[PDB]
Amino acid sequence: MFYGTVSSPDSGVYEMKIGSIIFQVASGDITKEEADVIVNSTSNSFNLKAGVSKAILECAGQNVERECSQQAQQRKNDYIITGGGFLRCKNIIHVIGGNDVKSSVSSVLQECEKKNYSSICLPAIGTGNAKQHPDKVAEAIIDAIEDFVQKGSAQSVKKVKVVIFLPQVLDVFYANMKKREG
Numbered sequence: 747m748f749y750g751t752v753s754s755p756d757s758g759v760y761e762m763k764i765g766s767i768i769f770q771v772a773s774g775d776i777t778k779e780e781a782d783v784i785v786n787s788t789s790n791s792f793n794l795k796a797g798v799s800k801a802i803l804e805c806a807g808q809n810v811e812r813e814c815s816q817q818a819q820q821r822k823n824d825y826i827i828t829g830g831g832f833l834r835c836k837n838i839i840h841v842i843g844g845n846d847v848k849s850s851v852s853s854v855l856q857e858c859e860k861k862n863y864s865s866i867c868l869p870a871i872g873t874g875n876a877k878q879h880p881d882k883v884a885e886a887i888i889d890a891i892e893d894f895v896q897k898g899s900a901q902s903v904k905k906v907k908v909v910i911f912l913p914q915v916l917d918v919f920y921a922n923m924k925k926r927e928g
């Protein structure tokens with residue numbers, strides 16, 4: 747009831763509509779992207795510096811690292827929202843890589859509607875240090891977006907892009923898109 751056709755608008759980029767949202771995947775360095783929100787896949791202490799989290803915390807800078815540790819000591823958080831630091835975004839949302847990926851993406855979408863944001867960029871959450879399987883992660887990310895659209899919750903959010911470090915993981919996302927296509 748929601749899926750459009752899969753195509754390639756630019757070299758190495760693949761896209762399809764999911765209701766009112768354009769869903770895109772590409773390989774590359776997420777720290778070079780511009781979006782209202784960039785997502786970090788981190789540990790339950792919000793201080794992982796390995797895999798994509800290393801690059802995100804290094805490029806964001808020490809004020810963002812300090813925001814993370816300040817919030818982590820205040821309460822038990824499922825995820826935290828910080829400034830963008832020196833990344834090209836308005837906020838970073840730091841999710842726990844080992845948590846249920848569908849739940850994490852649903853939370854990101856809801857927080858972006860609360861701020862009237864239009865664009866999101868995320869990694870293949872959980873496929874690094876957490877060692878969740880890439881097929882299960884792709885299925886969960888796309889299921890979260892489908893549920894958000896089905897409930898009529900997409901109003902401000904218009905574009906969700908997954909920028910993936912390993913080309914072999916991109917291939918798994920593309921196959922999942924083709925399974926769903928209208």
Ligand SMILES: CNC(=O)Nc1cccc(-c2ccnc(C)n2)c1
Pocket residue numbers: 787796797798799800801869870871872873874875911
């Ligand atoms: C959430 N997925 C990952 O963390 N995946 C993953 C796997 C292997 C390496 C990297 C990575 C990314 C940027 N910088 C560096 C030094 N390493 C990322």
Ligand SMILES: [Cl-]
Pocket residue numbers: 787788843844871872873874875876877
């Ligand atoms: Cl991870």
Ligand SMILES: [Cl-]
Pocket residue numbers: 798869870871873909910911912
């Ligand atoms: Cl990734």
